[PDB]
Amino acid sequence: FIPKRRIVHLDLKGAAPKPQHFRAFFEYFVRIGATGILIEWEDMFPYEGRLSDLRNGDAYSADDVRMILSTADQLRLEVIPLVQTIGHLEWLLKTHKFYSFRENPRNPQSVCVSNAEAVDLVLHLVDQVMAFHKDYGQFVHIGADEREDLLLRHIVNVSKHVKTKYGKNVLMWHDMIANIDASLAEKYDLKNLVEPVLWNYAEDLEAFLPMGIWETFSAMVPYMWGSSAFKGADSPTRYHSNVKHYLENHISWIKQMSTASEKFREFRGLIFTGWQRYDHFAVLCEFLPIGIPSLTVNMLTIRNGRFDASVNDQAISIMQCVTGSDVKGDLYGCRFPGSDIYHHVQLLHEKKGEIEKLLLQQSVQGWLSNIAIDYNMSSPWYMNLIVPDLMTYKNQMIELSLNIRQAMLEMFYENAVDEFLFTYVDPVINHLQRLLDRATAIQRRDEFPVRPFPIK
Ligand SMILES: [Zn+2]
């Protein structure tokens, strides 16, 4: 079983490329056998009217969006918009402006389904997007991911609005309905309204997925999609490439689809998720350039129906990496969009592992403790072995920061680089510097007090 639709998620909640660089990405997406993309604009769309105010400051122009979709179209890439319609609306409801619209007045996450002024804002939001996307895809994704009648009547509502006005098929995330009685699904004629997208980013799905989950859903709907991950599902603070993880998800998905393909009028395809933050408010996870290796190997793996040293190897020559090499281990001299940023961030991963190993060895542990730092009281001799290592790693991390800023600044907006550095690079420079200061001060002491000396 090979999914005929293979869709690459583009999550713009953060680290949203500058607009001239989508062509490159998209051409790469063709070159690995993607049929389409899923664009979650979040706050980066050129919103207008009442929504103009909840736009990212670095938001994309009308002329940009029109060029992005054209470029997609010309490269024979389908475009599915993702618009959140119930939850994950922090970007919209978190100012004063729509405070009134929230399910819970403290949480900027959900909108009150039962408040029709709010449902109205949602439908405008849909229409503002579909304005641009209408001429360019057969599908729309409405979210409804991470009393049941109010939910389903909200979905129904939204679905029909899209189906009717734009003649497209609605996809939503599965979690909202996996529980519900087959009965309620029929009551709301869901077999005719929505295509559930089942998502699971685990390595062994066989471990996490209930049994006859597929049997459950085929008894409810004719159309089903699946959703794997290439990035944004290791850890929230995952900033580097861990291909081994995503690859397990993809192998584990092949087996699943090869059992589920046949119980549906059509298993439509798989969406390769690529979260940029775990949520609006979370930190930046792995940048798209960092996810290219994962994404390359996992596309080829789903189209070849399994992973083998053949897959590995086409993968590499597509990335124009240096021959030999393993896609699961280190890669050198690759040439793909953002490949410099990859190179540099992967170095960051390595340097930081060294630095943590040094901060965990006997020297720093025993003689650069908190009492050493606060009471300038330790062995000069131990300093002489530490201070040199602190200074090297500190200076290397300073140069890494420069390089990454330069690399990332050709493709990303400042805030995104500033956020990355602030999160994943700078705290270490600061921490090395503060240790280097105290270890240097102790290295300069020659006279120490007899014990005991006051402590608190
Ligand atoms: Zn409510």
Author numbering: 54 to 199, 220 to 529
Quoted from the paper:
Hexosaminidases are enzymes ubiquitous across all domains of life and play multiple roles in glycoconjugate metabolism as they remove nonreducing terminal N-acetylgalactosamine and N-acetylglucosamine residues from glycans, glycolipids, glycoproteins, and glycosaminoglycans. We have expressed one of these, HEX-2 from Trichuris suis, a porcine parasite, and shown that it prefers an aryl β-N-acetylgalactosaminide in vitro. Toward N-glycan substrates, it displays a preference for the removal of GalNAc residues from LacdiNAc motifs as well as the GlcNAc attached to the α1,3-linked core mannose. Therefore, a thorough phylogenetic analysis was performed and the GH20 subfamily 1 candidate enzyme from T. suis was expressed recombinantly, characterized, and successfully crystallized, yielding the first experimental structure of a eukaryotic subfamily 1 GH20 hexosaminidase.
In order to gain insight into the specificity of T. suis HEX-2, we solved its X-ray crystal structure at a resolution of 2.55 Å in a C2 space group. Overall, HEX-2 displays a modular structure with a N-terminal catalytic domain taking the shape of an (β/α)8 or TIM barrel followed by a C-terminal three helix bundle, whose function remains unknown. There is one protomer in the asymmetric unit. Analysis of the interfaces and assemblies with PDBePISA37 revealed one interface leading to the formation of a crystallographic dimer around the 2-fold axis. The structure also revealed the presence of a Zn2+ ion not far from the binding pocket. There is also a disordered surface loop between the Zn2+ site and the binding site which resulted in the lack of electron density between residues Glu199 and Arg220 so they could not be modeled. Additionally, the positioning of the Zn2+ ion implies a noncatalytic/structural role, potentially in the stabilization of this disordered loop upon substrate binding. As the enzymatic activity experiments indicated that T. suis HEX-2 removes GalNAc and GlcNAc residues from glycan substrates, its newly resolved catalytic domain was superimposed on that of S. pneumoniae GH20C, which has been cocrystallized with the GalNAc and GlcNAc reaction products, which are also surrogates for actual substrates. 265 residues out of 320 aligned with a rmsd of 1.9 Å and major differences are observed at the level of surface loops in particular those surrounding the active site pocket and in particular the −1 subsite. This structural analysis indicated that either monosaccharide is capable of effectively binding to the predicted −1 subsite, whereby the key contacts will be conserved with the 1-hydroxyl and 2-acetamido groups.
